[PDB]
Each structure stands twice: as C-alpha cells, then as structure tokens.
Amino acid sequence: TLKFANNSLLSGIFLQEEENNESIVKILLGDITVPQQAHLITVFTNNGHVIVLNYKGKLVESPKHFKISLADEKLANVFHSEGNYRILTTFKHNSLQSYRLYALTFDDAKKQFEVAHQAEWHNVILSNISSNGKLLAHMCKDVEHKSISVVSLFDDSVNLSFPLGSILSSQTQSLSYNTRYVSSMAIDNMGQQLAVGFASGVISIVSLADLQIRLLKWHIDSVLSLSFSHDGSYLLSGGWEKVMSLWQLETNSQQFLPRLNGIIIDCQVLGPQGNYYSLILQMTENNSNSDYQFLLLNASDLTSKLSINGPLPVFNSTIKHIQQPISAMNTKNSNSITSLNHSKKKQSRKLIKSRRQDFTTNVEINPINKNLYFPHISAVQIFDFYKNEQVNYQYLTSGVNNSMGKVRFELNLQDPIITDLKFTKDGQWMITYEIEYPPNDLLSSKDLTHILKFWTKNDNETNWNLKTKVINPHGISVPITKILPSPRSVNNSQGCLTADNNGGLKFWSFDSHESNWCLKKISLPNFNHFSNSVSLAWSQDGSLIFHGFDDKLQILDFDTFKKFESLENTKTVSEFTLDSEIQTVKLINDTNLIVATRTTLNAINLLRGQVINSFDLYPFVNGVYKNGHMDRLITCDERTGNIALVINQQLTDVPTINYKSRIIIFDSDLSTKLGNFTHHEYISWIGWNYDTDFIFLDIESTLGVVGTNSDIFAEQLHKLSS
Amino acid sequence: STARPRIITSKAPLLPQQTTPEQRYWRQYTSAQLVKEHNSVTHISFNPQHPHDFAVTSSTRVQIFSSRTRQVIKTFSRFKDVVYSASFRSDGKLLCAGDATGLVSVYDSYNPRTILLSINASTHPTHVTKFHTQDNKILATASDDRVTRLWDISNAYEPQLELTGATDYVRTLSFIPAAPHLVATGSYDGLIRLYDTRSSGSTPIYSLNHDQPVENVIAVSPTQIVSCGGNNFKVWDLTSNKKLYERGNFNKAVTCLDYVENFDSPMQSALIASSLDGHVKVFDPLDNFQVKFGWKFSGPVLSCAVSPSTAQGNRHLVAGLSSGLLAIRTKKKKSNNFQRMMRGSEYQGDQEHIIHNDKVRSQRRMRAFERNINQFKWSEALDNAFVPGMAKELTLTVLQELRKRGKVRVALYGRDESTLEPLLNWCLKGIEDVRSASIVADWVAVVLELYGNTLESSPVLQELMIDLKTKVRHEIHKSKEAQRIEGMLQLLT
Amino acid sequence: KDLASATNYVEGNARVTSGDNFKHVTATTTGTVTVILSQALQSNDHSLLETVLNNRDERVIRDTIFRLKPALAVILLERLAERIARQTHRQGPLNVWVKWCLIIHGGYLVSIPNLMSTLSSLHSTLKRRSDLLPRLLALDA
Amino acid sequence: DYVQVADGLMVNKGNYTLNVITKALEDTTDTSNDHLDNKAYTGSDEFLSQYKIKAKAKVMSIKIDTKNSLVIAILQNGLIEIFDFKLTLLHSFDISYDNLKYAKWFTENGTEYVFVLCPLQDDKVCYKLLELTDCGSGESSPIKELSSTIIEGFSFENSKLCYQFGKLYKLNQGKIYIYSLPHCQLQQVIEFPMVDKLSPGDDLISFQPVSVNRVLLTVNNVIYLLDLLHCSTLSQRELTHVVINSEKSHNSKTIAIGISTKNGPNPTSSLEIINIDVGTNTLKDSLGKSFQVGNNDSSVILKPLFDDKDINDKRVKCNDVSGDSSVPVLHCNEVIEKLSALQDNDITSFDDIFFKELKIKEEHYTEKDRYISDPGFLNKVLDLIFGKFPKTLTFLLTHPLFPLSRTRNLLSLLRDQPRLFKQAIVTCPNLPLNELLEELFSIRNRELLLDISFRILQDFTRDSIKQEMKKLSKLDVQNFIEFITSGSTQLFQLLSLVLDSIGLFSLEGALLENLTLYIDKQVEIAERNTELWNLIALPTYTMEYLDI
RNA sequence: UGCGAAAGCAGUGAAGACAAGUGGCUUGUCGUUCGUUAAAAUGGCCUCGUCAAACGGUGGAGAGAGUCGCUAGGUGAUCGUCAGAUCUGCCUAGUCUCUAUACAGCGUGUUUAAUUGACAUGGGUUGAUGCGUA
C-alpha cells in the first residue's frame, strides 16, 4: 500500500481541512517519462498532476511527478494505446458540461506534456468509451431533443452522429419518460454495435452500420451498467436487481449471477481473453452514505476472486453530496428520474440551513480479537483495522435482505435496522437488538416489532450462531433505549441489562441448568410519560446500578433490583436530578462518575456524595445531536480518563458544508485537559479499544487512534529465470 | 455471489409444558402389548449379560419372554406353591426362584427342565432371591422368617452367612456395587439395615431409618442407595449415612424401583419407580431426582423393569400389574466383469498428494410454497399455501413471507368467488389462534379492501363473512375477558 | 463457499420466547369432587385432572375450589394456565376455574411473594390472549 | 472511604464459653479472663507483662510474662506440662501456635531461634536479623516480618528458616504499623492525620492516605482492606476501609485502647474484667453497598462553577450552535451580591427582591437554559426570600422553574393561591406523594384534580404510590368514587390504582354496584368510540335514449 | 418539514425552455433556474447430484383415524294447535382410545450432541392419438 499521508511527497497535493476535492482519476501501468522499461504506475489526478509511483520494493524518497499545463478544466480521464495518448476534459445556461479531447507528448523538456486539442463537444449528457480505449460515444443535446454520436479518438476511422428519436421506438413516444431515458450506454471495439440501456429497463443494441435496433428486455427496473465483451459477442448488463446478467448476443441467452449483495453500477470484462469481470456494487441498503464494494471475479466458475470493501458505517443522515442512484421511481432507497436535482438542492439546503448536523454511528470492538463490528442495515460488517480489510459480512435479521433483488415498488420497504449490538465482556456472547418495520397499506402498518437476540461463537470461526431471541422485550410495542452488558462479576460477564423509555429495566442472564439466555430480574414502572433520554451504568462490584432516565439519575441495588434505600439514612443519595435530559452517565472508576446532559457536563463522587467539576455543553451540543447519541459521541477508560469530542461546522465569511473535529481528553475526573487535538473532518464515533488507546471513526470512514563473477552470474541467472 | 437463503418457518414464542428431550426419548416407547397372566405379577427381572430376555413371575410359573418378539420363549411351571422371586445370575447362566414354601429352586436359564439345585430354605415363604452382583456363587434368599441368607451354591445345605437382626418381614435385598461385602436389606419396619459380611452378620453395621415399611431398595452409585416404601422413596448416602433426597410424587405406595446407567439416552441415568396407582415414573438422578416422564396403566402397578444398559437391541419397558396382566412398551432400532471394468469408484484417495473437494452437499428439498416464492409466483404461492394437508405453521410462514417480502394485494389480484374461498376458509380457523390472528387480520383487511363488489355480487361468501364476524366476536370476547382476569390478577399484587 | 458471499441468517434451533416469561426472579354444600383434585395435584395426573374438570357446573366448581386446600390451589392455577395456553378452545370453561381460585383463596396468594414469577405461565397466557385485542377491534370494525 | 460507624486468646470464638481468651490487666497482679467460667491459676505470672496469647486449645494456655520463657498453664483439668527456657529477658508477648505452625524464641531483643510447639522442640537459630521495633507473625506462607527503627525491613518464613526478603524500610514510631485485613500489606497508621498501607512483600508503599478524624487504637478485621479504629480522648470507635463469602461480624480480631473496650467484637459486651455495655452491630466489609454510608476522608466541599473548553485560538468557534448569545459570562460575585441585594427593604414590595433577581437572571422570566447557577446558593437565596418576606412575581416564578429545589416544597398545600398552586403542580420538579395524595383527595371538584393526577401518574412508580396510598381514610375514597360516578382517563387509571391499594375484602355494596353500573356504561361507550376511530358488470337488455 | 415517544402537535409558490392541442391562446412536461425549515416496452434472480434410510437438538395449532362413550352447546326437515313426535337429526368444541411423534424445522464438513447406503449423474427409441375402473 502507498499511503497519501505517509509521505510529504504527495500529501502536499492534499492535506486540507476543507479543500480536499482533489482526486486520482486514472492509473496507467507503463511509464510516461520513458517508455519500453514496467514495475511502476503513473497516476493521473483530476487537476493535472502526473505522478510516477513505484509499487515494487520500497517507496522512494521522491516521486517522478509532473503537472501538465491546462486551461480551467478538470481531467475526466486519460486514454492510452500504442504510442499515442489522448485525454478528456470538462467545461462550463442549462447546467451541462462540455468535453474536450487533447493529445499528450513529452519529448522536448521533461516537465511539460504538450497537448494538441483534437476535438470538442459543447454539451454532453452521457459518455462512454470502448474497453480498449479506441473509441468513445457520447450525447450532444442540440435542438428538438438529444442526439448520440460516436467518435474514434486515436484515429479518424469512425465518427457518426444521429438523433435518438431514430434509435427509439415509435411506440414509446406516448409513454413515460422512463421509457426514453438512457441511463447507460456501451460500445464495442469495432464500432459496429452500440448498447443503450434506458431507465424503463430495456436495452437496445443499435447496429452502428445502419441504425437498426435489437431490443433486449430483462431488467424489471432501471438499467445502470452495461459493457460489451472483447469480441463483441457478449453483453454484460447490470441494474437495480443485484443480478449481473451476461447476454449471449447470438441467440439472446442470459447467464445470471443473482445475489451480488450490492446493485451493479459498473461492469466490464477485464483480461485479454476475458477471464475476469470487474464489477462495482453500490450497496444501497443504507441511504445515509454511498458506499461502494469493488469486486472482480473470474469468468470460469464465477467465484469472487478478490473482493474489496472498506468500512461500512450507517450514519444518521446523508453526508456530503451523497446521492442515491437513479431508478424508475422515487422511493426511500433511490431517487427518481427527475428528483435528482430536486433532492440534491434539498439536501444542500438541509446541510446549510438546518440544525441537525448529526452524523454519528455505533461501532463495537470484539474484546477478544479487537476487530470492530460495524452494524449495517440488518447485517454486520466485521472489519479488523490492523490490516484494514473486512473479515466478513453477516445478515442478522429475517428480512428479504438477500433472498430477493429489490426493485421499483418493493424498494419502498426497508430491512430491520440493527440499532444496538454489544459484546459481553468475556467476548463469548454478542447481544443484538433490531426493529422490525412493517410494510405499508395494511392493518399492521403502524406497529413496529422489537427483537432482541443473543448470539455466540467459538473463537475460531467467523460467523455467529444464534442461541435465543426474545421478541417484544419489555412488553409489546416498546423499544429498548439502551442495552448494557455486565461487568465480569455477576455471572462471569454473562448478564445484560436492558432499559425501556418508560424507566423499566430488565436483567437477562445465562443459566446452564436451562441451557439458554433467559430473564431473571425486572423493575417495571408504568408512568404515562415517555422519553428516549435513558442511559445506564453498572458498578464493577456488580452491586449498584445507575439508571439515568430523563432528569432522574436513580441508583438501584442489585440484591432486590429496587431503589437504593438504607435504614440508617446516612445521606444515602439515591437520586441526582440534573438540569436537563441526560444522555451520558459514564462511570470511569468505582469512585466517581461523569454525567453529561444537553446543557452541561458534571462529575460526581460517591465516596464523597456530591458534585466535583463542571463544564458547559450548551454551546457545543445544543440540539445538534439526537437525544441518545452522546454515549457514542464520548467515552471513557476503565482506569485512566475520558474523552470529550466536539464538532465545529466551519463557515464562510451562514455555516457551510465542511467541519472540523476538536477532541479533548481529561484524566481522572475532569481535572486537566491533557489532550486537545483537531482533525480535518467531522468525527462520528470514539471508543476505548482494550489496550489503553482510543480509536475514532471519521466521516470519510478512516479509522484513527489517540495513544501513548559471483554476484554478476547470480543476478544474470535470476534475470534469465524471470 | 451467494446461495439463496431458505424460507424460515415461522416459530412464534414457546408455550409452557413443551417437549423436553427426556420426555421425547421416553415418549417414543410405543406399541404397548398387553398379556393377561393368571395372577398378580409380583416380580420381574432381566438377563444381564446379553440382556435380551426378561423373567416375569406370575403365580406358580415363571415366564422368560424374549426381547425380539415379546412373546414367551420359555416357561417354568413345576413349582408347588406360589412362586415369588425370579432373578438371573450376574452372567445370565442360571436363574433363581423363591417360592411360597421356602424352596429356592435354581434352574439354568434357557433350559426349564434341569433344576440345577433346590435349596430348602426356611419354613415360611421365601420372598426375595438373587445372586451376588460381584460374586457369582453366593445367593441371597430372604423369607418371612425375618432373616436373609447368603448360601453358597456349592454347599446348599447350610448358609455361608445368616443375616439376622430384623424385626418384621424382610422383603428386599440389594448389594453395594463396588464393595462386595455389603448387603443392604430392607424390611417392613422401615430400617434399611446393611451388613458387612466379614463381621458376625447378626448385627447390621448401620441402619437407615426409612419411616414407612420399605417395599424395595436398590443401589444406584457405589455410594448412594434408593429405598422405596410408603408414598415416598428416600435416597441415602451410605458414607455420610444420610438421607439426601426424597420424592413422594405418587398417590399410593411405591412398589418397586430400578435404575439404568449410561444407556443411549439424553438422560444419562434413570431411576424408574412403580407405585400401585397406575403410575410408573422416571426420575433423573443428575438434576436432583426430578421426574421427567410417566406412564399410567389399568390397575395397581406391582412391579416394573427396563432392559439394561447394554441391551444393544430392542429396548423394553415392562410393568406387571396386580390385576393379573402385563404391559410392554418398546423402542425399536452387478457382475465381476462389470465391477472390474467400473472398478475404482470407492477410492476416496488415501495415497494421493492433493485432495480436492467441491461437491456441494445436497440440501433439503424445497416445498411448493418456497419454490413459488423463489420463482416469484405469489398467487401460486398462496394457492400452494391453501392445499388440504398443509402444516399450520407452514401456511402461517408463507402468509408472513408474502406479507413481509412483497405485497398482499399483488398476491391477491386475480381472484373470484371460488378462488377466494380457500383463503377465508383458512382464516376462519386461523383467527382463533394468537400466533396467527394478526396476520389473518391484515390479510382479510386487504381482501375486503380489494373485493368489495363481490360481497355484493357473489352470495357464496356473504355468509362466510358473517361466520367470520361471529368468530371474531367470540375471540374478542375471550380477548377482553382475559384482560379482565389480568386486571384481577394485577389487583392481587 | 465464497469469501465475498454474505452469510445468510438462519435461526437454527434457537429458542424463541417473549418478554413476559417471568419464569425466574353436616355436608350442606354439594357432593363435589375435591379429594379427586387434591390427589391429582399432589401427583401430576392428567387423566383424572381431566375427569375432575370436564365438569362445568359453576357452583360445584365454586365449592370444589372452596373445599380445596390453599397449599395446592396455586398449582391448580398452574395446570389451568398451561392447558389454556395449549388449547385455545379450552379458555371457555376453564377460565371459570381461574376466576374462582383467584377469588376464593384471596389471602394466600397475596401473601405468596412472587405471584408473577410462580404464575408466569398465567401472566404470559393472559398477556398473549389479550395483547392482540386492538387488532381484531380494527378487524371487526 | 469510611464504613458504618457507631459505638461512641482464641480470637475467633463466640459466647456460651467458660474462658476462651485470657489477657493481662492494668493495675492488678497480672491477669484475668472473661466468661459468658473457668479457673485462672498461676501460669508463672507476677511480672511486667502486658500482652497475651494461648496455645490454641484452651487446655494448655500460657501466661506470657516477663520471664524470657513460659510454661503450660492449668485451666482445663489442672495438670501442668513441662517447660524450657531459651531467652532470658521477657516472654511477655509470646504467640503460641498449633502443631509446628509458628513458634520461636522471640522475647524482647531480636534473638529468635527457630523452634516448634512442644516443651523441648527447637531448630537452627535464626537470630541474624535486625533488632526490629515492629516484629510480628503472619500467615500467608507462615512467616515473621520485622521492620526496624534501626531502619530496616525483613521477612523470613517459619517453615524451613526461609528468609525471603530483606531491605531497609524507614518507618517511624507511628500509631499502628500493623498488618492489613488480608495481611498482604502493612498499614502503618501515622499518629496525627495519616495512614499508609505499604506492600509487605517488597518493602514498598502502596497507598499513603490521610485520616478523616481522631483515632488511636485500630485493628484490621477479617475483611478485604478494612480496620476498626477508636480514639484516644474519647470512646469513639469508627471503621475505615481502603469471610469474603459470608462476612465476619464479631470476634475476628481485637486491639482496643479506648475507654476499656477490650475483646472488641461488634457486640463487645463481655469485656475482660469490665463487664460493661456494647455498641455497633455491623458485618465485615461488604462489596459496594457501604459506599454511600461511609463517604468520608474528605469533607472539603465547595461551589464548582461552570468551566469551559479552554480558550486557545477560541475566536475560531466556526458557527457556534447557540441561538443568538455568543458567550454567557458568569458573574458569581454579582450573584453573591444579589443575595445581599435580595436581603434588602422590599418587605412586601417587588422592587428590591423581584426585579433584582430578574436582573441577575436576565431572560423572559418563563424560560430556563439561561443557566448560570448553583443549587446551594439558590437554596440559600430561596430561604432569604422565604425569610423576612411568596408574593414575589419574578424570582419565585422563574425559579420553581429550576430542577434543583432540594425539599423546600412542604407547604405547597399550606399556601393556597390559584395560579401559584397550579404552577406548583405543573412546574415544580420535586413535589412529594404525600401532599400530592392529599391534594388529590381534598377535592372541591375542580380541574386541579386532573392536573395533579397527571403529575402523580407521570412522576412516581406504582409500588411507591400504592404503599403510600395505603395510608388514607375511607370517606376520602368514598367521595372520590362518588365524584367519578356523578361529575377522566388518567383519573380512570388512578381509580384503578386507588382500588388496587384499598385492599381486597372490606368494602361496601351499593357503592360498588354504582361503580359497576358506571363502569359498564363506560365500557359500552368506549367500544363504540374505538369502533368509530377504527372505522375512519353488464346486462343483456337495457334501454336508453339518444339525442335527436 | 421541524419538534417529539413507539401517540401526535404546528406548516405546505415564481420564472425560463420545449412539446402537444386550438404569432396569439390553453394544458402538460423538464439529465433549466430562484425561494420555503418543506405505476406500467409481456419486462423479474445460474449451474455445480438426485434418491432412500437413520441420528442429535429445537418447536408443535400436534398428523390422522375412531368410538352416536361422557360434557357443554349450536341448529335443521316434515308433521303436530301446543304438548310433542319421526329423521334412531346434523354439526362444533372439550373429554375418552389409538398410532412410526405420526407433524414441522435445523444440523450430523466439525461440533455441546448427532450420518450412512444406493447410482455408468451418458447416448437411443417410444413415451401424449397408448386407459378406465366414474
């Protein structure tokens, strides 16, 4: 791996807290400084840098990088063949970009690539290039409607232009705009057939010799990705159903790959003889983020050779110009053919104008092997960050999460949402709570169901066996506002404590005589008020519980599971009403405990039954977090401190898109700010991994940490046996 | 890519008095044969060694039944009073029978014609006779003379020990299974006396005070014995000399006991007890002797046994009643040229360097509703749901998969009068049960929402809706009055 | 199986339950049947439990429970809760037997400390039979 | 970190015994014992002894006197045993043990040869240590530990003359430099305000704490890290903490130099020669439920004001999430001045209390979250307004809108204004169930009943409500039910609460039939209104016309 | 959209361009813009091995047949003024008796427990006009 932040050699290109739009846009395998000599790649970035990097051996002390001279464009992609090189660029009323092709040379002085400016197209709706980079088709949009044109970009062998009313059917010009909306296109290497996949779902292979079309109808929803094979006899196609189909274009026979756990937004054949297929899965279950799983697979048995995935969190709302992809309709997991500009404008105004800049997540650490579990929608991504690659993926609920590709009207469902999972402190059990949502338009559309599950596994394997599941924990139609594992004293850490929003508690623990995870204790007050500002703490003796309901931080025993009352009444304070709704009751050691509400942040000793220190939270968390997210905001240690974690929305000369993160650790009951650090991007989650460090998750999901004749003959023989 | 995950059956939360694995295993003892003997079946024992036969003592005849066909194979008729006890030796080679004249006749097993010897014991009826479990040449016979005896079967004229010291009607022997000097006898004055045989033998070494007159005493472990008499059995540690469990879960007196160990069962060891009231019950001596299953027969059950720990075949449970009859319940267990041509198909690669293995293990066969859902035939999934002999949780689970997965209206578009009647005909029964009533609710809700005009036109389902309304009225009456009982239980807090 | 293959959810043989099993924490009346019931509940006798409560004359039920001992009235409630949990068509003539023994032995089972725990089969039976009321209210509406 | 404090030789026995503990007594010949009685013969007494043990059978005890050795005494049959002398100064602190456990010739001067528990038993002489002023016996792997004001420290086991540790530990002549409750450490209780527990396996200090109060004589009990300490100039005996399965309540250890508190159990009644009263009745150190009782060793409370995330380039706040105000500056000197400003000449006015407190809390007078406050200060100023002066309009309306009132709420029934009591229901966030119940059952048939039912049903748990509304008369619930029948939802469920708390049997007939008639009509109309809420082709021959 | 609990409480436009129908008019649309916190083109998901027989755990409304045997009901035909008859009235539910737990589901690769056995996993010709047991 060649990390950007591991050297100043190209971290000077981007380190900025706001201006980080700079992106790598092409990778070539040769060398553009000198030809004919390859173990090293040349990366083209979207501004004009041409960085020659080495990946064989150790990374050098200086790259071979240049920066081409340009006009104000933005470097869409580069094209490479025998000798010649072209490059594509974008321009500037109707909002559509314009494309422009240049050619590159290098010979005279070794910093400058002379461009040559072949061709220009002044409005482009859509563009695609052949798999060898020998031709590119595009749309032009000159007026009554659009028009499609193919150009060849390394020689003047083919160019043609024609209106897509001559492509389109005559029966479709009385139909919806889904039946006329080209959402993907493709070309072959000879320029003889061009595939146009619309948004209604059908594909149309026009023959570029004379414009006669052949229709291929399989996709019941929109088409998102197409490619031709190298010989032009097979057509990869992919859309909203997570089925990579490949069309045998002689007799029109599909071969299906049906459950790809992500919708296909790009597919192309890769090898010389077409042995691998590279695909991109957009993973549309969480709409809070656009997270793409990259995947190649070999064509032989269609097994995923080398799938590639980052960490997959699910934020509270959408983040930064994150658009769910197009479809035939508008639903909760896509946006329609029209509503894309509407919802990017609405989400931009929700970022600028609105109040709830709340983009935090829940993440756990397995206390055995320290890998972190990102709860996805109805699933978990187990990901270990010592080598930053996903262990595996596991669906945990009984949804249609995998047994059906979801399309137009049935995209309007959503899976059970994994809202809580926590490990028991011995690492041998995983407690999980998720909310089954019902579908609409029937009698039971109003009542969610709540499911709590207890899973176990031995340490060798990578999936979790269910042991039992309680449905309707705490009664019917009530949530669990906070679950808590036990400290290692009450059942050798095989106990759990679940809190309602009616102030009720339940104690669930493992017994062996009845080999299951069952219910021991209960405390049920039925008020007629409800509030999701519930929090919990447990004393490491396994003795007293700290039930932080709204305004009511009660103290419960663990003998009889009721309110802490001593007959001598020696100021046995069993109640700390604070000023507002509390959201963190985090105990650090057995002595004291740090509480945080939406206004302030207190510390309270219990071998000295009163308050000790205070800090403000009102100018930082006013209402900018949901009532219940401060515990995944801030955390503690078992011994040596706690960590506040605040967020500043950086503003112009009205607040703007970008943020900065200010983290501050105090040690041992709020005494001294021994750590004050600022990172470039909004931060979502911090936690204590179990070797006295604290790890955090960014909003561009980067995990971070805060912590303490002979040799001549030999070389010639190894070069001849190479 | 992935394998398509199966359709999960709909398991609703569990209910009390469910099937424990122990009662599952015991409940599959079926096909209860009855045999009408002539008189009350006093005693029944099993062959030990190849334990495949059991000797049943009716009056004046001992019948060895076999455990492959459950009929009498051999019979012993030549007694002169009522025969009382019949037991096989530890090796199974010979059989002792105590008589009502005090004449312990030992035959050989599997030959009723050779009386091997005949002990003239005491003048009163000898009632319990059994060989040593560790030794093979001493025989314990206790009589209505309040004295048990250890005879040597070489010297059958005088007993090698004469265990006196009792006060009323000794009826039971046992031996302690590790220490072979220790004889635990039991009499009608409680008082499980037990004797070390190295000593004098006229005085027990200690006495275990059962209150009621004991009827049986067995030994479970080397260290704990179980004595039954009166309404209860009491278990006794011999070392600590101490009663440490008791069960009195019967109505009438416990007649007899026995015990199995390490046989093929979820229950590791089992103590079954027979108690004069129809009931024979099994207790699990690992989780503190709790009852786990029980049978009820048509009289006072006077003696019971089960086939021993190494039966290796047809596993039997027999109970002989005092009515004169007997009940048995069992659990049951091309050419050379062509082969030389097609030889190596049995190989599996012992000497082979690499071994590849990608043959997928063939799963369960998908049912009709599951494969219709997997092919997205939703109306056909409903048609396949409402076939006659279908399981009720299977109909429930396909209703749940149609409801959650897709859209009930989509599954319910092309219907009419004859193709809606199976749905509502199931909804009549399915609105009863609590596991199904909410799904039946929103299913019938959307079907009346889609088919309102057929309730005008077709009169074949008008009265179907009427009788559905009556069943909803019934179950909402029960679902309100149960809330009333919940309130008057909340008042009693 | 593949390494990019997501692990499918399967329940296996996991136990599913609810949040309501709290299983842990001179003659002049009638000639009734109450010695039948007491020596049925001392044992665990389904046959003559069924012959002592297929009878549904309400006053014989009443003075049967009155003549019944308080020490096995609670286990009578346990057997009754189990069987109306199993057979839902038995909730008619058998919640008579439960609305009497709550009434007749009033002090004993309000002195017993955990009625919810030792009768959580009855808690779960009534809570399940009565939590689905508003749905069939909407249905018959 | 104190414990439950009150009360102001075989050492593991109980009462019902003759004499299980013998000790030397002050201003007598030598010694005595106690009862709950046996003989106390001459075991070669009449010396300068002060300390006492026995040989752990109560049949062969020892009168450990200044003889340099000892004999076996006679208090079980009368028959003596044989003796021997090793050292020759004073055996006045002898600790005789069981069968070869820990016995050695430790007289007064660090000359302990190894030996065993018999008359002539002996072994190799381990007198090469320091003349330690703190030489004692412990039972972790049975040993003797010796720390010296010649400064030194050492540890040697009485099993194989097994010297395990030796260094220099400069402990001073403190009050009690005695081994801890589990004995792994040595708590050196310093004289005036201090006690340090030092790790007695490597001569290293583990916790040097201060003391809470005055204390002279302490004894570490059978606890985790706990001792009991009594004062010099007083009979005050408390317990402090820094057998573990069923705690040790009485007669586990004893050392006490208060006012004659000898043989100190919890019930330390049967003293040695005193025969006086007793004291505290606690157990040993429990797990974590003693923490709120023993909240001592620091009584230095003060007022914590609201601090901040401290200012270092804090002008770069970057769109602070507050409404319009940017920084609330805390003027606590001005708030302490507002206390003296409220203590001024507005005895029945509103110009020198009301607008003063509304100016030191600047808002729209019905809104919170403009907080710059302290609850002790607010309690004091609430008392300075409930003193010489509840007619105030601003301060006593804007701060019962405050979550920190601290039980100043008792006369909220005793004052009876319309609007002040309605606000006292719907805003005062501490208002107990006794006076809520009395205002619930002091009906004048008004809507304050409804608003007080909402508060009692949203604020308190049902068991705490029902055990308190046990404590009511019958005619208040009778006029309550007669109100509910004659002249509503929280009232319905509070009727359910009242009926559940009223008991089971002792009620009346026509009142119950009245509630029955009423409740059945309520059920029928609830059924029909829920029903309302849930309730919201071609022929072969026709004949029509066509236009002309 | 905002706020909140899972209930609910408040609040919902203008320009530009194009097409169609009748330079104008009228409507509809927008891979055009500003502001507000604001359904459809006959079109659906792969193979890699099936079958039979056991075994271990998990649930079960049990899967099904009887006995006019009890117990509670619900209801019908004809007659008969009703009383009451003939169908030895029918059905439901509970009970009583039974059986391979018959029922369903998950596994048995290594697991807390639990698996073995068949088969050339081809090609060819019929097999649908050759069937009555209604």
From Swiss-Prot, chain A:
A cellular-component GO term for this protein: t-UTP complex
Name this polypeptide is given: NET1-associated nuclear protein 1
Major location (coarse): nucleus
Organism for this UniProt entry: Saccharomyces cerevisiae (strain ATCC 204508 / S288c)
Pfam families attached to this UniProt entry: WD40
Domain of life, source organism: Eukaryota
Localization in the cell: Nucleus, Nucleolus
Note: Present with 6560 molecules/cell in log phase SD medium.
UniProtKB/Swiss-Prot annotation, chain B:
GO cellular component, as recorded: 90S preribosome; nucleolus; nucleoplasm; rDNA heterochromatin; small-subunit processome; t-UTP complex
GO process annotations (BP): maturation of SSU-rRNA; maturation of SSU-rRNA from tricistronic rRNA transcript (SSU-rRNA, 5.8S rRNA, LSU-rRNA); positive regulation of transcription by RNA polymerase I; rRNA processing
Compartment annotation: Nucleus, Nucleolus
Highest taxon, organism lineage: Eukaryota
Main location: nucleus
Keyword set, alphabetical order: Nucleus, Repeat, Ribonucleoprotein, Ribosome biogenesis, rRNA processing, Transcription, WD repeat
Matching InterPro entries: U3_snoRNA-assocProt_15_C, WD40/YVTN_repeat-like_dom_sf, WD40_repeat_CS, WD40_repeat_dom_sf, WD40_rpt
GO MF term list: U3 snoRNA binding
Pfam families: UTP15_C (PF09384), WD40 (PF00400)
Function summary: Involved in nucleolar processing of pre-18S ribosomal RNA. Required for optimal pre-ribosomal RNA transcription by RNA polymerase I together with a subset of U3 proteins required for transcription (t-UTPs).
Subunit annotation: Interacts with snoRNA U3. Interacts with MPP10. Component of the ribosomal small subunit (SSU) processome composed of at least 40 protein subunits and snoRNA U3. In the absence of snoRNA3, forms a complex with other t-UTPs. This complex can associate with pre-18S ribosomal RNAs.
Protein name in the entry: U3 small nucleolar RNA-associated protein 15
Curated annotation (Swiss-Prot), chain C:
SS bond list: none
Domain of life: Eukaryota
Repeat positions for WD: 67-107
Localization terms from the record: Nucleus, Nucleolus
Function: Involved in nucleolar processing of pre-18S ribosomal RNA. Required for optimal pre-ribosomal RNA transcription by RNA polymerase I together with a subset of U3 proteins required for transcription (t-UTPs).
Subunit-structure text: Interacts with snoRNA U3. Interacts with MPP10. Component of the ribosomal small subunit (SSU) processome composed of at least 40 protein subunits and snoRNA U3. In the absence of snoRNA3, forms a complex with other t-UTPs. This complex can associate with pre-18S ribosomal RNAs.
Recorded family membership: Belongs to the UTP5 family.
Note: Present with 33100 molecules/cell in log phase SD medium.
Name listed for the protein in its UniProt record: U3 small nucleolar RNA-associated protein 5
Taxonomic source organism: Saccharomyces cerevisiae (strain ATCC 204508 / S288c) (Baker's yeast)
Taxonomic lineage: Eukaryota, Fungi, Dikarya, Ascomycota, Saccharomycotina
Gene it is expressed from: UTP5
Swiss-Prot record, chain D:
InterPro entries: Utp8_b-prop, Utp8_C
BP terms from Gene Ontology: maturation of SSU-rRNA; maturation of SSU-rRNA from tricistronic rRNA transcript (SSU-rRNA, 5.8S rRNA, LSU-rRNA); positive regulation of transcription by RNA polymerase I; tRNA export from nucleus
One GO CC annotation: rDNA heterochromatin
GO molecular function annotation: tRNA binding; U3 snoRNA binding
UniProt feature coiled coil, ranges: none
Keywords linked to the UniProt accession: Nucleus, Phosphoprotein, Ribonucleoprotein, Ribosome biogenesis, rRNA processing, Transcription
Subunit and partners: Interacts with snoRNA U3. Interacts with MPP10 and UTP25. Component of the ribosomal small subunit (SSU) processome composed of at least 40 protein subunits and snoRNA U3. In the absence of snoRNA3, forms a complex with other t-UTPs. This complex can associate with pre-18S ribosomal RNAs.
Protein's job: Involved in nucleolar processing of pre-18S ribosomal RNA. Also has a role in nuclear tRNA export. It acts between the steps of tRNA maturation/aminoacylation and its subsequent translocation out of the nucleus. Required for optimal pre-ribosomal RNA transcription by RNA polymerase I together with a subset of U3 proteins required for transcription (t-UTPs).
Additional notes on this entry: Present with 16800 molecules/cell in log phase SD medium.
Protein name, as recorded: U3 small nucleolar RNA-associated protein 8
Origin species: Saccharomyces cerevisiae (strain ATCC 204508 / S288c) (Baker's yeast)
Record lineage: Eukaryota, Fungi, Dikarya, Ascomycota, Saccharomycotina
Gene transcribed to yield this protein: UTP8
